[PDB]
Structure formats: structure tokens, C-alpha cells
Amino acid sequence: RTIVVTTILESPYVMYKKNHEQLEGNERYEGYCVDLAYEIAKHVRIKYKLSIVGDGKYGARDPETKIWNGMVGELVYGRADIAVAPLTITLVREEVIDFSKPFMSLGISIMIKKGTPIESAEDLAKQTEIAYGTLDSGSTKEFFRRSKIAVYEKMWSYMKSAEPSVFTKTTADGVARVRKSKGKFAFLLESTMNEYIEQRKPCDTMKVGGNLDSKGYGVATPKGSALGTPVNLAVLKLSEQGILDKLKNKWWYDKGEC
Amino acid sequence: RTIVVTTILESPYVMYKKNHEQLEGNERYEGYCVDLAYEIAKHVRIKYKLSIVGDGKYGARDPETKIWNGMVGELVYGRADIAVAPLTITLVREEVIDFSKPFMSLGISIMIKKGTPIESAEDLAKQTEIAYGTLDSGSTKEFFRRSKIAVYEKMWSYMKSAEPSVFTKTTADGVARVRKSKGKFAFLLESTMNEYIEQRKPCDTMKVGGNLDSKGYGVATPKGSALGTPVNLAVLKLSEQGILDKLKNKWWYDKGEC
Numbered sequence: 097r098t099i100v101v102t103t104i105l106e107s108p109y110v111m112y113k114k115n116h117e118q119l120e121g122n123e124r125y126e127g128y129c130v131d132l133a134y135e136i137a138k139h140v141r142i143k144y145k146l147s148i149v150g151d152g153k154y155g156a157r158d159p160e161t162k163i164w165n166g167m168v169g170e171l172v173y174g175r176a177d178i179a180v181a182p183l184t185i186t187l188v189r190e191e192v193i194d195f196s197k198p199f200m201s202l203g204i205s206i207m208i209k210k211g212t213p214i215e216s217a218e219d220l221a222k223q224t225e226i227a228y229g230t231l232d233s234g235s236t237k238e239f240f241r242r243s244k245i246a247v248y249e250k251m252w253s254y255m256k257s258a259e260p261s262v263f264t265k266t267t268a269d270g271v272a273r274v275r276k277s278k279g280k281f282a283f284l285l286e287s288t289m290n291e292y293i294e295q296r297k298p299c300d301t302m303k304v305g306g307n308l309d310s311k312g313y314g315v316a317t318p319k320g321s322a323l324g325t326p327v328n329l330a331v332l333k334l335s336e337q338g339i340l341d342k343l344k345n346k347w348w349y350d351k352g353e354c
Numbered sequence: 355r356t357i358v359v360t361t362i363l364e365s366p367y368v369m370y371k372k373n374h375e376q377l378e379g380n381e382r383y384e385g386y387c388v389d390l391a392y393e394i395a396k397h398v399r400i401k402y403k404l405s406i407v408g409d410g411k412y413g414a415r416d417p418e419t420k421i422w423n424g425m426v427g428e429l430v431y432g433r434a435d436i437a438v439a440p441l442t443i444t445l446v447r448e449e450v451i452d453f454s455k456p457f458m459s460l461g462i463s464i465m466i467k468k469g470t471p472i473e474s475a476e477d478l479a480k481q482t483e484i485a486y487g488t489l490d491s492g493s494t495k496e497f498f499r500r501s502k503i504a505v506y507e508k509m510w511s512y513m514k515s516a517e518p519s520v521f522t523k524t525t526a527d528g529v530a531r532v533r534k535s536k537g538k539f540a541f542l543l544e545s546t547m548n549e550y551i552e553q554r555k556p557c558d559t560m561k562v563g564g565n566l567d568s569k570g571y572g573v574a575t576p577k578g579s580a581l582g583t584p585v586n587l588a589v590l591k592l593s594e595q596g597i598l599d600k601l602k603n604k605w606w607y608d609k610g611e612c
């Protein structure tokens with residue numbers, strides 16, 4: 097009767113509240129997906145408990161063991177009933193889990209430290225003075241790995257072999273690396289995260305250029321699960337009532353520091 | 355074995371080829387959705403015949419007879435197997451048909467004749483010198499009808515009662531009205547259509563302001579139909595291989611005249 101909602105610590109989607117160590121259960125957390133989970137659970141009429149995914153990953157299949165990790169894995173192996181997180185709707189995932197229609201629309205983007213001489217993916221691909229990378233084990237990495245587009249192929253060949261590794265284990269590590277590298281590292285990440293960081297002190301990074309693709313995040317359920325339909329309709333209702341727009345404003349812009 | 359694909363004449367999604375009267379069947383048509391249909395049918399491995407929806411409408415339920423019209427109706431009553439068209443994914447439709455994940459992301463937008471003193475929905479709502487309207491029987495009209503947001507409520511109250519009618523029967527009639535009204539009519543339509551028109555001679559209209567919402571178009575099938583899964587995966591594959599981006603470029607920008 098209490099359903100398990102797997103999610104991930106990723107600002108501003110899910111973050112610890114300032115006094116979290118003095119709190120328990122759902123009250124430990126705040127952010128866009130915490131609010132999204134509350135609203136969906138209210139429409140679908142369920143009790144639920146937030147659970148930060150143990151391995152801190154979004155979800156990918158190990159090509160050897162064929163085992164899924166991350167939140168995708170929580171759903172696949174029946175350890176979580178729903179995932180409410182910035183989880184990208186992709187073909188390979190759609191084969192093994194279900195997704196609501198998108199609750200946010202976004203694309204892969206470039207983050208630079210301000211002043212960096214880079215305006216586009218082409219600009220990065222044609223030089224080597226500025227290193228660039230992505231989050232490990234997520235959809236952005238897979239994008240470069242799978243792309244058959246020339247410039248992206250070129251970027252992948254550079255990233256796959258770059259030493260020291262340019263694949264970070266969290267988005268926050270990528271951001272720090274941009275910020276500490278004096279313009280010699282750029283980060284490839286989703287425009288939503290990029291746009292949030294750009295609005296936060298020290299206000300030293302910015303998104304450059306257009307997005308590389310157009311896609312969306314979806315609330316996910318195990319394949320064939322009974323919750324999938326209600327959740328989907330809940331997402332569409334929140335979209336049409338403007339709640340999703342409201343929440344984006346709340347967590348990105350209303351508190352903008354730059 | 356030959357499946358019926360309902361669609362709608364709406365530039366640049368489906369248009370008559372220049373010498374259509376000398377042609378037959380699928381060869382009569384060209385445009386983004388014609389290409390989209392071809393690509394999906396190739397992945398799903400089906401033969402199909404394009405069929406322009408008889409009533410020229412997207413789809414709405416008559417509140418009296420409770421009968422669905424337009425392409426939604428073609429699917430609901432089993433006269434078409436698939437719809438490939440700029441058909442907006444909405445809650446009420448999702449109750450009676452299925453939709454792939456979105457193949458295009460868009461939002462409601464304002465089109466003005468260039469020079470018109472209007473920058474926003476607020477600007478329209480607070481004056482009456484400039485009339486404004488929408489397409490009849492589509493999702494934009496429903497948006498205003500259903501909105502609980504102040505400015506939009508105000509716009510709806512004006513449109514619902516405006517005389518002569520501001521609800522056009524096709525998008526093209528709305529555009530003509532903007533173009534012939536010397537700045538005294540603005541049109542509320544999806545940003546995709548708005549963006550296409552803006553790139554076409556006489557180059558006398560433009561999109562102003564941000565979009566009013568964020569949503570998407572989806573390929574639609576009757577509820578519970580076996581084609582739904584394959585079509586969905588086909589859409590995600592085309593998205594990830596960049597075909598959808600390619601097609602948008604082909605039909606909007608590559609041939610831009612402004």
C-alpha cells in the first residue's frame with residue numbers, strides 16, 4: 097500500500113533540506129521532483145516513500161552481465177514501483193520499462209566557464225586545448241557513443257580515449273571541474289541542469305549555443321504496471337493546469353541569483 | 355494489410371504536390387508528415403494509404419452527441435488505423451486513443467502582422483483595438499476555454515463572445531486574416547505553424563513573445579491497438595537518429611524565404 101518511489105539527488109530536482117539530518121522519511125528532501133511526486137501521488141491517490149537510488153545512477157545496461165543499474169534497474173528488478181526524477185525517455189529504456197508522456201522538454205547542451213572561446217559543438221570538436229566530458233552512465237554519454245553525425249562522432253572519439261577520464265560520476269563533479277579549470281574544461285549536460293546552474297552563484301558558467309537534440313523526461317514504471325496509466329493521465333493534467341510550469345519557475349528562476 | 359493513415363492538409367505537414375491533380379494515392383502529397391509516415395511505415399514494416407480527414411478537423415468531442423470528430427474520430431470509430439499529423443497530445447484525447455511519445459515539441463504562440471504593437475498575451479488581454487482568435491475545434495481553443503490563469507481567462511471571455519467570430523475553420527484562414535487586417539487581428543496558434551509561416555513570403559508576420567505552454571505532437575492509434583508499441587519505438591528511433599531534426603530542417607528552414 098505504500099509504494100516505493102526511486103529518485104536521485106540532483107539539483108534542483110531532489111536536494112536535502114537544510115535541516116535534513118534532523119528529519120526523517122520524505123521530509124528530508126525538497127525540490128522539483130519532490131513536489132512532482134507529491135502532486136502525482138495526490139491525483140493517483142497513493143501513499144509513497146521517496147528512496148534515493150543506492151548507486152546514484154540514472155540507468156544503463158552493463159553490456160557484459162546485461163544487468164540494469166541505477167533507477168531503471170530499481171524498476172526492472174521490482175525494488176521500486178515508480179521513479180520520479182529527471183529520467184530521459186530513450187528507446188533502450190522504453191524496451192524494458194514504461195514512461196509517462198514527458199513532464200519537461202530539454203536537450204543536450206554545452207556548459208562553459210564564462211569567457212571560454214567556445215560557441216558550439218563544432219567549436220569543441222575542432223580543437224584540443226579545451227577538454228570536454230559528460231556524466232557517466234547516462235543518456236548524454238549514450239548519445240555521443242551512438243551518434244552517426246560527423247561532429248558528434250568526432251567528439252565521442254576524443255572523449256572515449258581522453259586521459260584523465262572526462263566522464264564524471266555526478267553532474268556536480270562536472271560543474272566543479274568546469275569552475276576550477278579556468279576555461280580549459282567544458283561539460284556536456286542537459287539544458288535543464290545547465291540552465292539551473294547558470295542561475296546560481298558564483299554565476300561563473302553559461303549555456304552556449306543551441307541544444308544538440310530535443311527530448312523529454314518521463315515518470316517511469318515497471319513494464320506493464322497498473323500505475324502507468326493513472327500516472328500518465330496525472331502528468332497530462334498537471335501539464336494542462338500549468339503546475340509543471342509553476343514548479344519549473346519555482347525551482348529555477350524565482351530564486352535566480354545571476 | 356494496407357493500413358489507413360488519417361492525416362490533415364496543414365502546411366508544411368501535409369500539402370498537395372504541384373502536379374497532384376495528375377497523380378494518385380500517396381504520391382499526391384508531400385510534407386513533414388508524409389515523410390514521417392514513410393519512415394515509420396518502413397520501421398514498422400507496413401503498407402499504408404494516406405487519407406485526408408473528411409471534415410478537415412483535428413478532433414474534439416461534441417458535448418451534446420458525445421461524438422468525436424476529426425482525426426481523433428477516425429481512430430475512435432475504427433475508420434483509420436493510425437494518424438500521422440500535427441496532433442497535440444492532450445488529456446482528453448489520451449482517454450480515448452493512444453499516442454506515441456512526442457515527435458515534435460511546441461507551445462501556443464502569438465502571430466502578429468509585423469509592426470503590430472503587441473509583445474505578449476498580457477498586451478492582447480488588456481486592450482480591444484486588436485482582435486485576436488484561434489483555430490476552431492482544436493487544442494488551442496480548448497486551452498483558452500479550460501484555463502484558470504487570469505490573463506487567459508480574460509482572453510477567453512473576449513474570444514467566446516467576439517462578433518464577428520474569431521474562431522477560424524483552418525489555420526490558413528487565420529493567417530490570411532492577420533495578413534489582411536493591417537495589424538488589427540492577431541492569431542493564436544502553435545509555435546511550429548507560427549515559425550513556418552514566418553519563413554514564407556510575403557514575410558509580413560512574426561512570432562512574438564514566449565510560448566504559452568509546453569507540449570508535443572504524437573502519432574496516434576486506436577486505444578489498445580497492436581500498432582501502438584511498434585510505432586512508439588519507431589518514433590524514438592527516428593528521434594535518436596536525428597531524422598526528426600533533419601525533417602524539421604527540410605520543411606521549415608532549408609527553404610526559408612525571409
Ligand SMILES: NC(=O)CN1CCCC1=O
Nearest residue numbers: 203307308309310599603
Ligand atoms: N538541426 C536542429 O536544429 C536540431 N534541433 C534544433 C532545436 C532542437 C533540435 O533537436
Ligand SMILES: NC(=O)CN1CCCC1=O
Nearest residue numbers: 341345461565566567568
Ligand atoms: N512560466 C513559463 O515560463 C512557462 N513556459 C515557459 C516556456 C514554456 C512554458 O510552458
Ligand SMILES: N[C@@H](CCC(=O)O)C(=O)O
Nearest residue numbers: 154182183184234235236
Ligand atoms: N537525464 C539523464 C542523466 C543526465 C545526462 O546524462 O546528461 C538520464 O536519464 O540518463
Ligand SMILES: N[C@@H](CCC(=O)O)C(=O)O
Nearest residue numbers: 412440441442492493494
Ligand atoms: N495541433 C492542434 C491543432 C492546432 C491548434 O489548435 O492550434 C490539435 O491537435 O488540435
Ligand SMILES: [Zn+2]
Nearest residue numbers: 115116117118
Ligand atoms: Zn552531517
Ligand SMILES: [Zn+2]
Nearest residue numbers: 373374375376
Ligand atoms: Zn484543379
